[PDB]
């Protein structure tokens, strides 16, 4: 029961706490790569957290340098600045795995930019921003989650991760108005004749129902054609990636049934996303 078994155990916590459909798939992983996606989550946890510690760049700086000092020492003995941890747990998976550093530098720069938020003009920021919090997260995990890393295998990761970003933008307008992020883009929003703050007073209509439904077809588009390359991930990877896509994908269905609600996070019953895993063992 040792201190790296620890430092794992701890990302795990991390894991389960504050993802509860991505800890419910892939927690039924083997325990080598649950372990590493538990870690890389904690990272990427961590850095998605890191502005409201202090209320500035501080705790940032330190996770990226911690990152830094792995890619370049990756055998050393660091005295980490951030998260210890997390650090360690993901210095013993980078002995191991070819990690995507400048994939976890996009992701930082991304929550960096973040700072000085300014709305999307098109939907190609928007899918910009995507690639940055999520497409780069696919990335990461790709040496993880298949046997032998080509373009393709990297293309459908990305493409995975940036899909489910949407539907989580799609999940949670309301929370996000209120923190003072809109996500849709300025065109987009202008061409549909839909201004938020209002919806956020008035409920919905057709206008924001059908610019939902817009990008909700692409996040489901994208997740058709990932479902047809799932063969790029090692036999034991694709049943979880299907499923943790699948739970992700009812979650629009989830959002329908509340009537596109601004003022809750709907979710995926437990109870369900078992049943979502019962029908893809059937197929495999
Ligand atoms: C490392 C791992 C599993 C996740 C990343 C953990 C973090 C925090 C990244 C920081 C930026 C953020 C927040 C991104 C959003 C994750 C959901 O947020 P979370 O808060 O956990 O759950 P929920 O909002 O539902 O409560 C997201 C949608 C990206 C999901 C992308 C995946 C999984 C790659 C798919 C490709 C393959 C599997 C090849
Ligand atoms: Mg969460
Ligand atoms: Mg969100």
């Given amino acids: 029961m040792t201190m790296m078994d620890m430092n794992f155990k701890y990302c795990h916590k991390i894991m389960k706490k504050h993802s509860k459909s991505f800890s419910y798939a892939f927690d039924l992983?083997?325990?080598?790569?649950?372990?590493?996606?538990?870690?890389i989550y904690a990272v990427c946890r961590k850095i998605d957290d890191?502005?409201?510690?202090?209320?500035?760049?501080?705790?940032?700086?330190?996770?990226?340098?911690?990152?830094?000092?792995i890619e370049k020492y990756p055998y050393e003995y660091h005295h980490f600045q951030s998260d210890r941890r997390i650090m360690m747990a993901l210095?013993?998976?980078?002995?191991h795995k070819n990690?995507?550093?400048?994939?976890?530098?996009?992701?930082?720069?991304?929550?960096?930019?973040?700072?000085?938020?300014?709305?999307?003009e098109t939907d190609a920021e928007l899918f910009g921003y995507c690639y940055g919090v999520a497409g780069?997260?696919?990335?990461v995990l790709t040496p993880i989650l298949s046997d032998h890393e080509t373009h393709q295998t990297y293309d459908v990761a990305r493409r995975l991760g940036e899909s489910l970003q949407?539907?989580?933008?799609?999940?949670?307008?309301?929370?996000?108005?209120?923190?003072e992020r809109i996500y849709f883009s300025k065109q987009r929003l202008?061409?549909?004749?839909?201004?938020?703050?209002?919806?956020?007073?008035?409920?919905?209509?057709?206008?924001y129902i059908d610019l939902w439904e817009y990008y909700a077809a692409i996040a489901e588009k994208d997740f058709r054609?990932?479902?047809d390359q799932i063969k790029v991930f090692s036999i034991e990877a694709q049943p979880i990636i299907e499923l943790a896509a699948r739970i992700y994908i009812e979650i629009l269905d989830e959002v329908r049934q509340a009537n596109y609600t601004l003022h809750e996070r709907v979710f995926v019953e437990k109870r369900k996303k078992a049943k979502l895993f019962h029908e893809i063992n059937s197929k495999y």
Avoid: C
């Fill in 225 to 227: 054609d990932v479902m």
């Fill in 99 to 120: 990690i995507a550093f400048q994939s976890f530098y996009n992701l930082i720069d991304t929550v960096y930019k973040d700072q000085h938020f300014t709305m999307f």
């Fill in 190 to 207: 202008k061409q549909y004749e839909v201004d938020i703050a209002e919806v956020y007073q008035n409920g919905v209509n057709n206008h």
């Fill in 166 to 179: 949407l539907i989580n933008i799609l999940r949670d307008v309301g929370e996000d108005f209120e923190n």
């Fill in 136 to 139: 780069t997260v696919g990335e």
């Fill in 91 to 95: 210095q013993h998976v980078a002995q």
């Fill in 29 to 39: 992983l083997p325990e080598d790569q649950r372990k590493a996606v538990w870690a």
């Fill in 50 to 69: 890191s502005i409201d510690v202090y209320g500035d760049i501080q705790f940032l700086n330190q996770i990226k340098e911690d990152i830094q000092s």
